[PDB]
Homo-oligomer: A and B are copies of this chain.
């Protein structure tokens, strides 16, 4: 039987590339999404057309709330209902926008940014672990290579990403006796935000030592694939920067 993976926020961009690569590798996939229902369904169609009964969708808001634990449980459940197992969890979904220290209420900003980047990852990890040889079980968290040199006015985003480093390490330690590995992949600049003008995008590309360009989504997915694979069986609690040297560049 083919192993199964949950990928959060998998309808577009890097999450989509991760789902596709895992599927190409032989995984059945749960495509979690929030608002991008058309893209999610279209991706499930494409993957199932390649191999029948290998992709489903699951919608959920991952904003922090009283009902988030239930939603996270239901996401993991959807993998078991469809495929009978859940071998890999990829925590990719993420809110990302500025939250100046000096639009939404601040409590909503907290809920969205800390929920998606940290609390949902923790609750999903709990549900994954509770629900569990030649098993190769693991979790991959999408972190941020620049968390120690953060973007101006993104404090809640950076707090969420830092908490996700903490979860990666804490869960690596705690889940190791069950054979569940927990690792991260830290992009620098990859797919720039769609809102961004090609001029502003070019300002970022020029800062990258390796090629003066952003990472493709596929290059990010390559690191996830490595971490879930049998070639990474002794690796837990590690975060692999995939940043073309960007984090090494001083101001």
Q: Which residues of A contact B (CB under 8 A)?
A: 64-69, 100-102, 105-107, 110, 114, 118-119, 122-123, 125-126, 129-130, 146-156, 158-167, 169-179, 181, 207, 209-211, 215-216, 219, 222-223, 225-226, 231-238, 240-251
Selected contact of A106 from candidates B65, B126, B149, CB within 8 Å: B126
Selected contact of A150 from candidates B146, B154, B166, B241, CB within 8 Å: B166
The answer to whether B160 touches A173, judged by C-beta atoms less than 8 angstroms apart, is no
Residues of B within 8 A of A243 (CB): 234-238
When C-beta atoms are compared, the residue in chain B nearest to A209 turns out to be B176
How many identical subunits does the complex contain? 4
Selected contact of A249 from candidates B149, B159, B244, CB within 8 Å: B149
The answer to whether A174 touches B155, judged by C-beta atoms less than 8 angstroms apart, is yes
Looking at the assembled complex, report how far the CB atom of A243 sits from the nearest CB atom of chain B, in whole angstroms.
7
The docked-state distance in angstroms from the alpha carbon of A249 to that of B146 is 10
The docked-state distance in angstroms from the alpha carbon of A238 to that of B164 is 19
